[PDB]
């Protein structure tokens, strides 16, 4: 269930509401500023890191479940999304339908959206690919 969630349902949740569009109308008292802007922030592919922990001083290092249990940390991994930034401008002529075009400011770019707690021995956890001797090295019970 957790492997299905992480593999597909996270991407499905991102892609249902991937795009977000805000229109700034001209609000033009004079016809010299008859332009309407359309700023779209679009989410794309989602990436999941290996389970990590950031310390106080900004040091981010790989977190193992024994260390998390000992130090009262959350055995979680970071979620990143691709964000691409479309911007459009149109000539705000009343009556005529607005036609938007890119100004080629299409910046895109993984950004951090939060930490997903990782259930142990799932495909994201370190203990899935570990052998029995590796579990003994990591002080985890086989």
């Amino acid at each position: 269930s957790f492997n299905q969630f992480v593999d597909y349902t996270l991407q499905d949740i991102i892609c249902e509401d991937s795009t977000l569009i805000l229109e700034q109308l001209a609000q033009h008292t004079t016809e010299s500023d008859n332009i309407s802007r359309k700023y779209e922030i679009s989410f794309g592919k989602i990436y999941v890191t290996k389970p990590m922990v950031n310390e106080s001083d900004g040091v981010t290092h790989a977190l193992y479940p024994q260390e998390a249990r000992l130090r009262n940390l959350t055995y979680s991994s970071g979620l990143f999304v691709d964000v691409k930034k479309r911007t459009y401008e149109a000539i705000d002529v009343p009556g005529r339908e607005l036609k938007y075009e890119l100004i080629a400011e299409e910046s895109e770019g993984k950004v951090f959206i939060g930490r997903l707690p990782i259930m142990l021995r799932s495909k994201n956890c370190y203990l899935s690919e570990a052998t029995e001797s590796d579990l003994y090295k990591l002080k985890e019970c086989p």
Binding site: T19, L20, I21, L22, E23, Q24, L25, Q27
Partner: peptide
């Protein structure tokens, strides 16, 4: 007086 910005539900 006109609202400057508004949300568009994508379709």
């Amino acid at each position: 007086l006109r609202r400057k910005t508004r949300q568009l539900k994508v379709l």
